[PDB]
Amino acid sequence: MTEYKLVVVGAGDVGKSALTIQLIQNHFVDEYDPTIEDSYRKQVVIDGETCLLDILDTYMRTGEGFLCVFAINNTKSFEDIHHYREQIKRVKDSEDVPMVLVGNKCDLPSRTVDTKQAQDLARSYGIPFIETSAKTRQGVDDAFYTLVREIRKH
């Protein structure tokens, strides 16, 4: 079937790796042990088109579409997403590159990125915003299938 090369980007401990795992083994890890594989893959169905997801946990010119991740519990990571999109679309000679902004760590009650704040950042960058929590799985599948449609409708 069709295969889609997604890479997860973002700042430190935002939960890039942690997002992946939950997507692949439907489980929430509390600490990765310094990089093992970094490049998993999963068979899924999206609207009948069953297809494969090659997730690269962070060369990435290969990437087809990108999830940009910031944790909502610290605003530095959320400021750094400009630096990422600006670099995603750098090594890609196109301001058009399938992309999803995801805010992680929703069970955390001391949030410091307003849900509006992302929401507006997203629309200004043209992309969609999803909120996730690898610990409670909420919208972890959601944020990935979104990216896959942003690649197919591209």
Ligand X SMILES: Nc1nc2c(ncn2[C@@H]2O[C@H](COP(=O)(O)OP(=O)(O)NP(=O)(O)O)[C@@H](O)[C@H]2O)c(=O)[nH]1
Minimum gap (Å) between residue 68 Cβ and ligand X: 12
The helix (H) or strand (E) run that includes residue 6 is strand 3-10
**Applying CB under 5 A, does 105 fall inside the site for Mg ion?**
no
Nearer to ligand X, 33 or 47 (CB): 33
**99-104 and 39-46 beta bridge pairing:** unpaired
Does residue number 77 form part of the binding site for Mg ion (CB under 5 A)? no
Q: Does 17 bind Mg ion (CB under 5 A)?
A: yes
Find out whether 66 and 52 touch, Cβ atoms under 8 Å.
no
Instruction: Give CA–CA dist 66/6, Å, rounded.
Output: 5
The yes or no reply on residue 17 touching ligand X (CB under 6 A) is yes
- Max Cα separation, the chain? 43
- 25 touches ligand X by CB under 6 A: no
Shortest spacing between CB 37 and ligand X, in angstroms: 13
Among ligand X, Mg ion, none, the one that 142 touches (CB under a kind-dependent 5 to 8 A) is none
